């Protein structure tokens, strides 16, 4: 689920940025599919939204999947092997968490008018 995603985000970035900062960024962060990914960070969010879609096609509800992870000192990692839907959804969230951290944050691309900018 999303509480765990927020935890995987803070682990991969190490406190430097709030999860709130990522939920209304560009055209795709916040899950509204629209236009072109404006940024590197915005492509992380499109890929993540798309990841969660394959998940739902395999029977995995991203919302209802409470998986198992461990936050190490280099960032998060998934511990599921057998419970296959929990590991798939964990991978969507872990790879997005690391993407968000390694990606540059344009403060100018946070909260853009998506009606205009994301067509």
The number of folded domains in the chain is 1
Handedness of CA 71, 77, 83, 84 (dihedral sign): positive
The runs of H, that is alpha helices, within 15-105 are 40-57, 84-102
Q: Which domain holds residue 5?
A: 1-119
Specified resolution (Å): 3.0
Residue 59 marked ligand-binding: no
Within a 10 A sphere around the Cβ of 33, how many other Cβ atoms? 12
The full DSSP string for 2-22 is HHHHHHHHHHHHTTSS-GGGG
Residue 30 marked ligand-binding: yes
CATH code, 109: 1.20.90.10
Q: Which of 24, 48, 50, 113 is catalytic?
A: 48
Q: Is 21 a catalytic residue?
A: no
């Amino acid at each position: 689920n999303l509480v765990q995603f927020s935890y995987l985000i803070q682990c991969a970035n190490h406190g430097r940025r709030p999860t709130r900062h990522y939920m209304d960024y560009g055209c795709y962060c916040g899950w509204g599919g629209s236009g072109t990914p404006v940024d590197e960070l915005d492509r992380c969010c499109k890929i993540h939204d798309d990841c969660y879609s394959d998940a739902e096609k395999k029977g995995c509800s991203p919302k209802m999947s409470a998986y198992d992870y461990y936050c190490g000192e280099n960032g998060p990692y998934c511990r599921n092997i057998k419970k296959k839907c929990l590991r798939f959804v964990c991978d969507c969230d872990v790879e997005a968490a690391f993407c968000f951290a390694k990606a540059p944050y344009n403060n100018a691309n946070w909260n853009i008018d998506t009606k205009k900018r994301c067509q």
